[PDB]
Amino acid sequence: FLGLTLALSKGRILEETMPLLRAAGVELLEDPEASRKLIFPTSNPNVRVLILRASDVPTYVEHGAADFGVAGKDVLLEHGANHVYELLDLKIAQCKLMTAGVKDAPLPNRRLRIATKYVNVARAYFASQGQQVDVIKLYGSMELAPLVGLGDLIVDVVDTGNTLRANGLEARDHICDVSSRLIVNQVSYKRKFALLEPILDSFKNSI
Amino acid sequence: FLGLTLALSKGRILEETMPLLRAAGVELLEDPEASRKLIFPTSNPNVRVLILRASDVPTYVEHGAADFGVAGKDVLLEHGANHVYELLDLKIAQCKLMTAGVKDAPLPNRRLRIATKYVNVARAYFASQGQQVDVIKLYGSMELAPLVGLGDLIVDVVDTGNTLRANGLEARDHICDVSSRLIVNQVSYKRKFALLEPILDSFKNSI
Amino acid sequence: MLPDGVADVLFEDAHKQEVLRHQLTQQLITHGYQLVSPPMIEFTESLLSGASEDLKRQTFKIIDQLTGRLMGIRADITPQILRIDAHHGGDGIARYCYAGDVIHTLPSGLFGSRTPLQLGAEIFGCESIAADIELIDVLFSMINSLDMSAVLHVDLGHVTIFKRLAELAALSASDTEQLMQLYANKNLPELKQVCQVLPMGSDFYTLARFGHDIANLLGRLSENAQQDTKIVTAIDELQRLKAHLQVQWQCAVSIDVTELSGYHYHTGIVFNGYINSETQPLVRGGRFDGMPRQATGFSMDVSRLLAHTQLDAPFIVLIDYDAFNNLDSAQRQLLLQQVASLRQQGYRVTMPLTAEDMPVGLTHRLSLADNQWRLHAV
Amino acid sequence: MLPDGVADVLFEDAHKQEVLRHQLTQQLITHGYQLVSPPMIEFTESLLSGASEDLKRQTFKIIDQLTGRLMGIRADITPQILRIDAHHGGDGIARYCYAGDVIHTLPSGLFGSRTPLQLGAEIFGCESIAADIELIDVLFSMINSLDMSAVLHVDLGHVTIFKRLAELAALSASDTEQLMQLYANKNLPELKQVCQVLPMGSDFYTLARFGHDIANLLGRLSENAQQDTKIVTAIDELQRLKAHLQVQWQCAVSIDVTELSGYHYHTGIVFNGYINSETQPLVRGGRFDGMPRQATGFSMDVSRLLAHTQLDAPFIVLIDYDAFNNLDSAQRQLLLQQVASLRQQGYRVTMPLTAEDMPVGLTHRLSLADNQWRLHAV
Amino acid sequence: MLPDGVADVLFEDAHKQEVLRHQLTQQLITHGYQLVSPPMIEFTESLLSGASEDLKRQTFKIIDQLTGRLMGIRADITPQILRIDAHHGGDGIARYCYAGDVIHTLPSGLFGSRTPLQLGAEIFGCESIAADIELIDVLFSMINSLDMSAVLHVDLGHVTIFKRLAELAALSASDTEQLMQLYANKNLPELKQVCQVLPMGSDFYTLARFGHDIANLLGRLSENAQQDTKIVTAIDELQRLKAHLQVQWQCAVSIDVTELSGYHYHTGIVFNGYINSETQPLVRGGRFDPRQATGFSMDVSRLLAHTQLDAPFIVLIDYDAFNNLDSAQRQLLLQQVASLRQQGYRVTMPLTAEDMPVGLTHRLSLADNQWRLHAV
Numbered sequence A, B: 001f002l003g004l005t006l007a008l009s010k011g012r013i014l015e016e017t018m019p020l021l022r023a024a025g026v027e028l029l030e031d032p033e034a035s036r037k038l039i040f041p042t043s044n045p046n047v048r049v050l051i052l053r054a055s056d057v058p059t060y061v062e063h064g065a066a067d068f069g070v071a072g073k074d075v076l077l078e079h080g081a082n083h084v085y086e087l088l089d090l091k092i093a094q095c096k097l098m099t100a101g102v103k104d105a106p107l108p109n110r111r112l113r114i115a116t117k118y119v120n121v122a123r124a125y126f127a128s129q130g131q132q133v134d135v136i137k138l139y140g141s142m143e144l145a146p147l148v149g150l151g152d153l154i155v156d157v158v159d160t161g162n163t164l165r166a167n168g169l170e171a172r173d174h175i176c177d178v179s180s181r182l183i184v185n186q187v188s189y190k191r192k193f194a195l196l197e198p199i200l201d202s203f204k205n206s207i
Numbered sequence C, D: 001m002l003p004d005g006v007a008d009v010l011f012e013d014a015h016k017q018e019v020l021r022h023q024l025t026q027q028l029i030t031h032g033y034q035l036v037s038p039p040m041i042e043f044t045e046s047l048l049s050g051a052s053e054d055l056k057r058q059t060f061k062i063i064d065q066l067t068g069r070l071m072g073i074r075a076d077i078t079p080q081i082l083r084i085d086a087h088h089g090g091d092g093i094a095r096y097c098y099a100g101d102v103i104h105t106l107p108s109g110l111f112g113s114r115t116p117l118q119l120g121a122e123i124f125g126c127e128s129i130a131a132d133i134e135l136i137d138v139l140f141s142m143i144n145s146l147d148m149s150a151v152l153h154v155d156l157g158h159v160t161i162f163k164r165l166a167e168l169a170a171l172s173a174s175d176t177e178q179l180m181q182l183y184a185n186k187n188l189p190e191l192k193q194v195c196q197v198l199p200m201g202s203d204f205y206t207l208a209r210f211g212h213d214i215a216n217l218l219g220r221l222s223e224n225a226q227q228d229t230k231i232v233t234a235i236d237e238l239q240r241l242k243a244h245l246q247v248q249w250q251c252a253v254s255i256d257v258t259e260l261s262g263y264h265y266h267t268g269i270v271f272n273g274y275i276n277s278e279t280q281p282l283v284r285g286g287r288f289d290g291m292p293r294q295a296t297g298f299s300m301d302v303s304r305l306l307a308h309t310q311l312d313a314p315f316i317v318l319i320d321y322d323a324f325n326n327l328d329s330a331q332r333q334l335l336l337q338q339v340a341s342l343r344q345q346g347y348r349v350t351m352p353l354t355a356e357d358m359p360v361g362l363t364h365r366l367s368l369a370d371n372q373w374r375l376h377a378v
Numbered sequence E: 001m002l003p004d005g006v007a008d009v010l011f012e013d014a015h016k017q018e019v020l021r022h023q024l025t026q027q028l029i030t031h032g033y034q035l036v037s038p039p040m041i042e043f044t045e046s047l048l049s050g051a052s053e054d055l056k057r058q059t060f061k062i063i064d065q066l067t068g069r070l071m072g073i074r075a076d077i078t079p080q081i082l083r084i085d086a087h088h089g090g091d092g093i094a095r096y097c098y099a100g101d102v103i104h105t106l107p108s109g110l111f112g113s114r115t116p117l118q119l120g121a122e123i124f125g126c127e128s129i130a131a132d133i134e135l136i137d138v139l140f141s142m143i144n145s146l147d148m149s150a151v152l153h154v155d156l157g158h159v160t161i162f163k164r165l166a167e168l169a170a171l172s173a174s175d176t177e178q179l180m181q182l183y184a185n186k187n188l189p190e191l192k193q194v195c196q197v198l199p200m201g202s203d204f205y206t207l208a209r210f211g212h213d214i215a216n217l218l219g220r221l222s223e224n225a226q227q228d229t230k231i232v233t234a235i236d237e238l239q240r241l242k243a244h245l246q247v248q249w250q251c252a253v254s255i256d257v258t259e260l261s262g263y264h265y266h267t268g269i270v271f272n273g274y275i276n277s278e279t280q281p282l283v284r285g286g287r288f289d290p291r292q293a294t295g296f297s298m299d300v301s302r303l304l305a306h307t308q309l310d311a312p313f314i315v316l317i318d319y320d321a322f323n324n325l326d327s328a329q330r331q332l333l334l335q336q337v338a339s340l341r342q343q344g345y346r347v348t349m350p351l352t353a354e355d356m357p358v359g360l361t362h363r364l365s366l367a368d369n370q371w372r373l374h375a376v
């Protein structure tokens, strides 16, 4: 395959990306949920699409299995976007990374135990606040961890705050703002710029 | 060996070449006759010398076994100097290529039989005179051939004419003037010009 | 024993030659050149129309038993391209390519081939230096696709500079022929001598002495030569192609305006591409007469690329004779489906006739282990 | 199982590595560079004197049991060259080369090596662009001796242009750090936004947008920038090296004045040599502080050349065990004289201990046939 | 200031070191030894598998930040050769050589180096004395190629003699450790004392007192020791190698059967090559560890004081004359310079009129359109 391979994040991000694509040359022929297909052709014959876990997008781009991709800034910070170019802030799928604990519960007199998917971000954030933390790695349902004692605080993406409030939790500290970003493989940027520039300019025009 | 290899003709030519060399950087440490050595070092460490049959010099140069060489023009015309550069007329070892027959003997009423070392030159010369000839190849003692009937005429190098007159022969036609020439391998001329130019200029100055 | 300059091309070399012929031809087609495949034999009337004496001597003759007329085995495809362009090409721009065997009566270089596989490209109907520039881009795109470690050096010439000087100086034929011999042999001293008594002699000396420095060549020539429109343009074309080669293609370029091989047929710019330190050019090209119809083109012997190119090592597979014959019909059809897929990918798979049937250069066996056919290296 | 980024180099690759290390070192010596071979370990006081934070994190620490002081395993030889130059180099021009193992705590690139064989060259005491030009000539003489089909692409930068703009514009540290991030990520739109409110903002936009076109870069900058002596000279140095690389060495050159890796240690021109489409540079070089003492240099991982270079296939010879033991003493001495001569020529000859003793990769047997020892291919 | 036992190798010494490393390696390759180049670092699990306590203390430890596991900087390449032979070597005879830097935490002898350039050769899969004989012939062929005036003296030992006596006498570990200390120090009086109360004590005294006289050593031992097959063969191997060294190589040999350094890893014959009267062996070798192995190694850096290269040719091009040249003249000069460099001349293109290489022997100067070399 000589065209561009585009790595898209599966869930929340995919919904707000589709309008940006259609404004460019690109739109999917099938639908991701209905079809059990991994590689998707588009309206543009020079663009191919991969529908991936949000966590896997940076990996595919960095190793050049995809030429470019749309990925959450929370995922890029946690992954370490060392070997990719972060070309555009798409300003979609906006949210915040925050700390959250139980409502009105006091901080214990010890090293805080942090339950999170975002272990590098947690460690980094609490290091910047001069706090030493014991980090516990989890993959899903961060809300649960403080309720059964698994950690004192969590770190997770928060938009409205309803999931936290519905489980008796409150937000504590703002870590940073998050949005989906356009990432491009270092080598693809040099070798396939002719294919990329018109798509990059249409995404730029779409905001 | 990274320096230049110089192909010299063994006999009559070698005597008149030695002065041209000494004026350049080059002079032999031993002597060619006394030593049974094929490859001779010189005063210049970048120049090597090969003492060869006069007939073999163009072959060694053309195949690049020698970078350059001194060779008779009679040998070059007979050989066909197609793949070498004839850079300089050295004006040494001068003589003529001629036809010769028996003194006062009549030409027979038939295709002339020519006995010679110089078969291509003979054929070419007699072709330019619009004459058809039967050529007989010999390697030595051309003078003898007409005396025992082997051919009607010979073709050979003549200087004073004494060898012809001492065997009862006379010169008939002048074919061309001959002198030793400086020949250089096509590839050596490009790759080793830096080594060649000072030697070429000193030979040029020596006449 | 084959004749001198005639060799079999066998086995992996034959496969490599077939890959090169095919891939280079396809590249030429994608650059917009129309492939033509003229015959090996023609009447001499067409094959040697306007030929040089060298081309005539290089061409084997044979008699047509149907008409009693003379034919030749082609030594060069270019004159067949002219015939084709005259019938099919029209007045506008036409592009052609080709790859075919040609036969020569004598080799060109020491131990050279008499049966080259001649591949080439030609543009008719464009006077501009842009057509020569396009040919360079096609050539170098082809050379770079070969992934060679061998370095191509390009020597540029332009026969018009000398031809115009010879006109303006009003040289006789013997004077022209002497200078060409002296140029051919780089005899600078004797050239210096002859030029002191010839008209515009210092110009003919300047070509040989300073022609390599093309940026300054016009300013070293005499006022009559600098006022000649054809000399100024020829020098300009040399500078344009030199620059294009260095900048676009990272190519070492030398200039030699005393390069007058093919004085007969070249009408302008000439190109000689050398591989490492090999004496005979790998690529020969330049302007010629397409007839008033402009033509430019190059050709090369594909067989001379074989020593400088490499393919990936082949996968040579043998199916186990015994295991295959133990199979039921359904098992055999599954195995053959697998074999068809391997062959589609370029694996060379031998279905054995006997228990001893072994292909040359065996790398792998396709063997049955616990109801599974896998490839195992030998 | 070895640690990530740590691999054996075995057999023909080991021989190739040894040949490369030796031949490249010898070439450097013939260009007038003095070979130095500093130790793997030093006190951190010398090894990390003026080191960046990346170099400190890249350096393994160990304790000296004789003094209780901290040492490091070197991650970079260049600081050892500075130590050596300070003691031995004097005030004039000094040239050094080296080739030694270095250890890194983390790999640089994806699946990169943590144990490169670091080879390099450095010139101290010359401010002129001529010293950088000489380093390029040495590098390219070395690269061309390797006879690779792989193509080296060179990217030039110059950190002074950005550093001087940052001074003249009087940028804060956070503004400097933001532009460096935007440059690193080629975020042109957001760079355009930030530059509309910064002082001399259009200059910082111009570097990213038009810095590739180095011929015209000075004329796109603001009057304050065009009057700065250090910007004019830095741009001039870029044009000089670009030209030298294209013309002398047939090298494709790109320019990137926003290439600000090693902002800490580079003081001027920077050079990054890429091999085919591999992400991490094969060669890294440029101006640095030799201390006021000028320094310029490059280095590379010799082990990354192994995949792109080839040696001639080895001759691996076995003497026949039975035939050798049948010999009288005089016959054995003649055979051993013959074997010594073969080994002098680089043949790998095994004297067998037993009738089964067989070297890996056997190409030839040295066999007795009618009172004559000849080599026969297997 | 470098740490104790740590030195730069600079300039002509560095060039000499590189020439020695390369020429010795190439010689080994031509004798059929396969070059291997293992890494400086490994996990300790592989690097110190079955290591002695001395080797463990000699090995620097560092932590792998990708796994949290311990690594070591190698103090010895031989264990890496074993790892390699186990994966690639098969059951037959396999030959390996190597040359690489190793790091030691403490110097081995008084004023020793902590960063030797370790070069060596090893044969696996041959039980015969012929493999040891081959290694001796390779070593001495290498030593003789160096054209040293320094003489190598060889001390032979054999750890099996003491190990078999210790078995037959049924010695405890503390008794074994005491005798090894007394042997290490040749404390003959105190050895005499301790041996009066040990079982087969007079045999352990005889090793130290008379082990040098290997021709008569078997006849000085007790009847139980003389009936032991392994003692008789070990003594026989010593006599065979001694003779081979004297006759084939004109080599002075001493015998010491109480040489028990590396008691842990040596399984038989041991070889220590001394250079003039220097305390630490230049060459260490012997049998080691079911797969047979024998080998030697040396510190290439210790050869530097005992070897000489031909004086280098160091050339400077005239600055002024070079800058007077036109472009075509410069390209001809550079072609000439490339050819000189191909021949091993060290040619400096000057950057300035003051640019002078260290140890200048020649100038390349222009006289009448000719660049010639003149001695300074």
Ligand SMILES: N=c1c2ncn([C@@H]3O[C@H](COP(=O)(O)OP(=O)(O)OP(=O)(O)O)[C@@H](O)[C@H]3O)c2ncn1[C@@H]1O[C@H](COP(=O)(O)O)[C@@H](O)[C@H]1O
Binding pocket: A010, A011, A012, A013, A054, A071, A072, A073, A074, A075, A093, A094, A095, A156, A157, A158, A159, A160, A161, A162, A163, A164, A178, A179, A180
């Ligand atoms: N609100 C978001 C949200 N907003 C934006 N994004 C982006 O979407 C990416 C994750 O996409 P997914 O929807 O696939 O991930 P997920 O829903 O966390 O987990 P899955 O079960 O889908 O695997 C992140 O990397 C963000 O960049 C969000 N990802 C997850 N959420 C969650 O959605 C819920 C809504 O939160 P409130 O609005 O605060 O109640 C909470 O559970 C939030 O943690």
Ligand SMILES: N=c1c2ncn([C@@H]3O[C@H](COP(=O)(O)OP(=O)(O)OP(=O)(O)O)[C@@H](O)[C@H]3O)c2ncn1[C@@H]1O[C@H](COP(=O)(O)O)[C@@H](O)[C@H]1O
Binding pocket: B010, B011, B012, B013, B054, B071, B072, B073, B074, B075, B093, B094, B095, B156, B157, B158, B159, B160, B161, B162, B163, B164, B178, B179, B180
């Ligand atoms: N006179 C010459 C003569 N003059 C110049 N040369 C050159 O010397 C080259 C041959 O060199 P050699 O002396 O080795 O050859 P050779 O003497 O013919 O034969 P050899 O027995 O030496 O092999 C020729 O290629 C010429 O370029 C001559 N070569 C040969 N001769 C012979 O010398 C004799 C003297 O001739 P007169 O002076 O006319 O009597 C006659 O036999 C001539 O043929």
Ligand SMILES: [Cl-]
Binding pocket: A161, A164, A165, A169, A170, A171
């Ligand atoms: Cl809240």
Ligand SMILES: [Cl-]
Binding pocket: B161, B164, B165, B169, B170, B171
């Ligand atoms: Cl006469």
Ligand SMILES: [Cl-]
Binding pocket: C116, C117, C118, C119, C299, C300, C301
């Ligand atoms: Cl052809």
Ligand SMILES: [Cl-]
Binding pocket: D116, D117, D118, D119, D299, D300, D301
């Ligand atoms: Cl490196």
Ligand SMILES: [Mg+2]
Binding pocket: C076, C077, C078, C299
């Ligand atoms: Mg043609």
Ligand SMILES: [Mg+2]
Binding pocket: D076, D077, D078, D299
């Ligand atoms: Mg460095």
